[PDB]
Structure 1
């Protein structure tokens, strides 16, 4: 059983004054709230029990939007991160929620998309020992956790936001962990950036020979919605796919239905109040159409 965490707080300075009114994670990516994207990622990984961590001010907003998850066949819980003191804090704030389980963390502003993403997630969720992370070729690796490989394609080092990156492979905001993660996190000291770093967690596993770094190929899209510009680009990306296909990306209701976490009667009840816009009409259609 893997438990899931969505880390959806974080500093808002950058996006002010746009996000003076709204935390980044509540802004729409095209036609739905940003949080639906990472939420769908956990769902596609087969995870139904999820802890959403956000700021004292946004946590109540998330609860209002998403409730307890029961309408979607999920178990959502919530916790507050008082200060954005680092990704790895997720595992301290989430210690009691995780228990003795395996886990997965996804970042609030990370959007993934592509063919057979469900299988890629399935493959990582099924390795019960160590940790799995994903490496993606990017233009500006200095902005991210960076992973270096040897001549044989094997991962050999990690560095957080290196001044002189050793590769162009970023470690994306999606992480699968075994039961070792909490104690690793508990032992960390803040980096010089003043954060409790997920890269330090991932390095702990790498130093024990227990970090699986899978390449997320260039056929996938991995987008960061963290700037005004990237938020725009991501909206256009989603729009182009949805308008071409007549299918929506990261509709939790659809995913719950396809996974059999809710039945047709439940989906029909979710479509009603949204019946007057394209979203509800979309849900209704999924009841009478086979989609492969």
Structure 2
């Protein structure tokens, strides 16, 4: 089987004061809270076993919205992310939840048009490793950047000052269970310094990373400008009576 993981932690400071009290991932994006989008993408892949990671202070509001998943035809489990570490350390918390299965990890503020199903199906037919999804963007300096040559990723660089390409590595990662070994057997405070790019480069060096360029639009929702854009793009998105309630 295939497990789903949504990373909804973070300070959301980029968005203060709107996120003074509210968690970024509960802010509107179209007619739905940001996080709904991630839940919908996974549901459309028949990935119903989902783990939600978020901060201690915001778990109440997240759970109030998501509940057990009954109302969305899915099933949620929650873990708390602590003050220290970021996106990479948060993934470690899912080791037991995943077990020997495979993963689709979606950073909560990554909103996009594409059904991820086709990429999940390819990954399912991939003997081992990982898969990243790329999106060509205007300001690659803000993201992880894929350096592609002759249809192969030679290197990934986090926030490069002078980008080698414009292919941003989106926050949708497909991983096998070996990712936990890398993190798990790091270590120790080196795991606090770890970034998702390092994990991706680890698969790359081992020669088991694959990639696909996404078709539709994509955007993060972590700044006022990008949050607004996400709302413009999401205006007409409709998830059906199951997500419209109630």
- Same fold flag (TM > 0.5): yes
Change (3 A) 1:178 1:128: farther
Partner deviation per Cα, 1:65-121 (whole Å, 9 max, x = no partner): 11111232211010110125121113321111111211121001000104x654344
> Do residues 131 (structure 1) and 135 (structure 2) align?
no
Look up the match of 1:140. Answer: 139
Change (3 A) 1:164 1:83: same
Higher helix share: 1
Change (3 A) 1:84 1:233: farther
Look up the match of 1:11. Answer: 11
1:86/1:198 contact within 8 Å kept: no
> Do residues 238 (structure 1) and 234 (structure 2) align?
yes
Query: What do you get for the CA RMSD once the two structures are aligned?
Result: 2.3
Please list every run of 5 or more consecutive structure 1 residues that lacks an aligned counterpart in the other structure. 243-247, 255-269, 274-292
1:147/1:170 contact within 8 Å kept: yes
2:143/2:158 contact within 8 Å kept: yes
Look up the match of 1:206. Answer: 204
Measured after TM superposition, the shift of residue 196 of structure 1 is 2.3
Select the structure of larger CA radius of gyration. Answer: 1
Measured after TM superposition, the shift of residue 61 of structure 1 is 1.3
Change (3 A) 1:156 1:237: same
Q: How many angstroms apart in 2 are the aligned matches of 1:249 and 1:188?
A: 43
**What is the count of residue pairs matched by the alignment?**
246
1:5/1:90 contact within 8 Å kept: no
1:190/1:197 contact within 8 Å kept: no
Measured after TM superposition, the shift of residue 185 of structure 1 is 1.7
Look up the match of 1:178. Answer: 176
Q: How many angstroms apart in 2 are the aligned matches of 1:225 and 1:251?
A: 23
Change (3 A) 1:119 1:252: farther
1:7/1:105 contact within 8 Å kept: yes
Higher relative contact order (CA 8 A, sep 6+): 2
Q: How many angstroms apart in 1 are the aligned matches of 2:239 and 2:9?
A: 20
2:133/2:212 contact within 8 Å kept: yes
TM-score normalized by the length of structure 1: 0.78
Higher strand share: 2
Measured after TM superposition, the shift of residue 251 of structure 1 is 4.8
Q: What SS class does the counterpart of residue 83 from structure 2 fall into?
A: coil
